[PDB]
């Protein structure tokens, strides 16, 4: 309807892209939530994996909130969609979950880069800076950490070695 | 598949009901999230309403987590479903959002009572106690608070009086 | 005359644009100064409006100083111009002054976006980053705050309700 | 229009003279601002001169604010005018800027004495006392300090001796 | 060989440019190291010049390390090259060394701007932001400081006046 | 050219040998730097190896600085040369890097012993004592530590056992 009194240099496409990204961040939150409680099962029982993915879940929820804040700051209107359940109910092993987290973070990062591209094409430097400042380096760090974790788990003998996942749990995530 | 080594006196129906309740708690989280950012809009701008519903959103997420913990404690398996978006994108007024929160909490409470009934019919006193201890009185308190809020807002002249919602924001939620 | 020993990748156009922006920031300072003392009049007497716009005036003066610092950092030369008096001597009401502050901040923001465009066209990433870092989000925040304030004042019954402006003074600005 | 409910023994001429003096104080603020950033240039680079004139600039702005406060206290109405840019963009040397500051403060003092004369002729002892209390001795002190500074700089060999200005910067202003 | 599991939107050209910049930062470290110990000679004996350039040397080494960190973060592979010795063994005077430091920092800055250009052409906003955030303003500050120092030394009578360099040593670098 | 006013009992050969040793210490610094960031790669990811070699790199740089200090103390003149890149870009494994560090420290030690021999042949007891005091026992300690590390890694099953390097990382270097 009529324009927001605050809206300036904020393209409708960018508004819609921010609504999509909000959904994605909430989806990531939900994936990490599912992973966490997988490690809390009595037949998995890797409680530092569980803590680690729980913390990641809460961070994703903050990423979503900051985008919702941003939408309103710029005078867009938030439109929420269903948060899809994760692909998996069973995440298999410590290694497998880390690998899927890595794929998830690379996908979120690709979405954030597309979003930056759009912002760039619509000459929205405030939005460019927002993405750069609060999102892009956060993704690079998260991706590098996950790569590091996957590498160690593999080198240690995961997923075959239940010993390896147990010791990684204690020494890296603990 | 084969039974959990921990599972004892935990009926499959109760397991499924706990998975439904987890979805509902996450749905409630999402409703309150949507309400919160509605009050953060530049054309609504009731920042204590926004804080209040944000805090409610985070509490719902903890309610969901405790049920996920419970599922595993008892040796059930968590099965997550889509978190539906809320009915509304636009919550109209402070009064209207409080009213919808009240309806939401009464629905969650009805689900929790049904769940207690099932637990009772399957002679699961641990599950009865869990629900009683962490959920039922929490719902009674939340419902009474919301009723109190709705009552004050109405008595003050909401929703017509923008003054009333502004002062309720400062004095009750502030 | 001969080039600054420090100057590198700093186009003359960008130098001139920074001198214009310095004038604008000082002009904004002066507007807020005028508004402030309007609320200090014995026939207006809204002392938190007065404090609020005084603080905004001092911030604008810091924005101007940082641009003057920047000019010298980059090896440009500051050229100062008259600081025009504000459009208004009489700002009418709390609501009207907030509305004019909103229009002022949107104009400053448009100038800052034009300046970013120029910096972008002249491939000055240091200048891009400067603007992004210290100016653009500051404008988005200031604009959103003002929108929020205008909205509340309107909803409360301003400008007709002298009660509304008095209570906004105490509860939001106080 | 109709008289201020607070106005008593405050002649219109005095009201107008206070509006002129407010402009002058803001003009002085602006001169000192310009001088300050001159010393911040990479080809001047006397950072304590810069600090010293910056502090003087901020003080002038407070002098202007106190006169604006006074106007309202007495029930006059503030009428703001353009703040003219300074005579100079380039202040030449430490010595030259101090000399121009001295001339500026003697001019402000002459205006303040004229203003006192008017106040005296209109039998406004409150206004007499205001000027005496917050302005006249402040000017005498500022003038004597500047004279002292000019004298030292000259005795040291300024402006020819770049060494002299550098050491004055460190030892007197530092 | 096969791609890094972490690599995303990171062009080979950018990877190579980061390896070049790492060499340059180490080269800058080495220049400042050489300058420092020049001032530690018994026939030069300006111990605050020596401290100042030593600190600059250590900072350059940190700049190099952060680029090496960045390379790995992004999934590039570090390729190190010889660190060339400095042009000079004998830096002549305080003034001459400052002048050469200024030329060095302007060259590093030109390399960093070229690198930003490449990053921009390959649509790598994370890399753009990295450069902006940790490098470009650091260069602008370092260049302005050096300009300031060169200016003072010249104004004081350097390099002919051994007195001037000695007093600059004590008062500016001390 | 003409002799240093401070120079006494300091043979030109010793002066040249100290310049060579300075190059070697910087070369060692550079080797350890390269090793460190190898362990920071996402496909190696042994962050305590990385810390350990980084710390060794910084120590080598201090060893180089103390020799540069010494050169000037004695009235020699520092002549810097290119710092060659390390032999390796890829250090293979934790065990392999430790082994190469051991070979590096034994080479530095052989150079330091040659240098002591020269100092002895030129009857420079101050230089003898310098080497003894700040270098020789430091090398013996560093060599013994590295031997200890290599031994443990081998006994643990390195380099085949990625588990072994991971646990050594946590327990010995951590
Ligand atoms: Cl727009
Ligand atoms: Cl649009
Ligand atoms: Cl949907
Ligand atoms: Cl980082
Ligand atoms: Cl059972
Ligand atoms: Cl059953
Ligand atoms: Cl579903
Ligand atoms: Cl109770
Ligand atoms: Cl009230
Ligand atoms: Cl109150
Ligand atoms: Cl230029
Ligand atoms: Cl140009
Ligand atoms: Cl003008
Ligand atoms: Cl923000
Ligand atoms: Cl009167
Ligand atoms: Cl009169
Ligand atoms: Cl005017
Ligand atoms: Cl006095
Ligand atoms: Cl890539
Ligand atoms: Cl490529
Ligand atoms: Cl090479
Ligand atoms: Cl800065
Ligand atoms: Cl002195
Ligand atoms: Cl000798
Ligand atoms: Cl000899
Ligand atoms: Cl060489
Ligand atoms: Cl020992
Ligand atoms: Cl342990
Ligand atoms: Mg994270
Ligand atoms: Mg995220
Ligand atoms: Mg589905
Ligand atoms: Mg950019
Ligand atoms: Mg950042
Ligand atoms: Mg609640
Ligand atoms: Mg609940
Ligand atoms: Mg639907
Ligand atoms: Mg209870
Ligand atoms: Mg502001
Ligand atoms: Mg501003
Ligand atoms: Mg005019
Ligand atoms: Mg920022
Ligand atoms: Mg003063
Ligand atoms: Mg004054
Ligand atoms: Mg004019
Ligand atoms: Mg008297
Ligand atoms: Mg007095
Ligand atoms: Mg530096
Ligand atoms: Mg550098
Ligand atoms: Mg060569
Ligand atoms: Mg920055
Ligand atoms: Mg060592
Ligand atoms: Mg060594
Ligand atoms: Mg070679
Ligand atoms: Mg010893």
UniProtKB/Swiss-Prot annotation, chains A, B, C, D, E, F:
A Pfam match: Ferritin
GO CC aspect terms: autolysosome; autophagosome; cytoplasm; cytosol; extracellular exosome; extracellular region; ferritin complex; ficolin-1-rich granule lumen
Subcellular localization: Cytoplasm; Lysosome; Cytoplasmic vesicle, Autophagosome
Gene3D superfamilies (UniProt xref): 1.20.1260.10
EC number: 1.16.3.1
Tissues/organs with expression: Expressed in the liver.
Binding-site list for Fe cation 2: 60, 105, 139
Site (Essential for association with cargo receptor NCOA4): 20
CDD domains (UniProt xref): Euk_Ferritin
GO BP, sorted A to Z: immune response; intracellular iron ion homeostasis; iron ion transport; negative regulation of cell population proliferation; negative regulation of ferroptosis; negative regulation of fibroblast proliferation
Effect upon mutating residue 25 to A: Reduces iron binding and oxidation rate
Stated role: Stores iron in a soluble, non-toxic, readily available form. Important for iron homeostasis. Has ferroxidase activity. Iron is taken up in the ferrous form and deposited as ferric hydroxides after oxidation. Also plays a role in delivery of iron to cells. Mediates iron uptake in capsule cells of the developing kidney. Delivery to lysosomes is mediated by the cargo receptor NCOA4 for autophagic degradation and release of iron.
Disease field: Hemochromatosis 5: A disorder of iron metabolism characterized by iron overload. Excess iron is deposited in a variety of organs leading to their failure, and resulting in serious illnesses including cirrhosis, hepatomas, diabetes, cardiomyopathy, arthritis, and hypogonadotropic hypogonadism. Severe effects of the disease usually do not appear until after decades of progressive iron loading. Neurodegeneration with brain iron accumulation 9: An autosomal dominant neurodegenerative disorder associated with iron accumulation, primarily in the basal ganglia. It is characterized by global developmental delay apparent from infancy, and progressive decline of motor and cognitive skills. Clinical features include delayed walking or inability to walk, spasticity with hyperreflexia, ataxia, dystonia, and poor or absent language.
UniProt subunit comment: Oligomer of 24 subunits. There are two types of subunits: L (light) chain and H (heavy) chain. The major chain can be light or heavy, depending on the species and tissue type. In the human liver, the heavy chain is predominant. The functional molecule forms a roughly spherical shell with a diameter of 12 nm and contains a central cavity into which the insoluble mineral iron core is deposited. Interacts with NCOA4; NCOA4 promotes targeting of the iron-binding ferritin complex to autolysosomes following starvation or iron depletion.
PANTHER family attached to this UniProt entry: FERRITIN, FERRITIN HEAVY CHAIN
Family according to the record: Belongs to the ferritin family.
Name by which UniProt lists this protein: Ferritin heavy chain
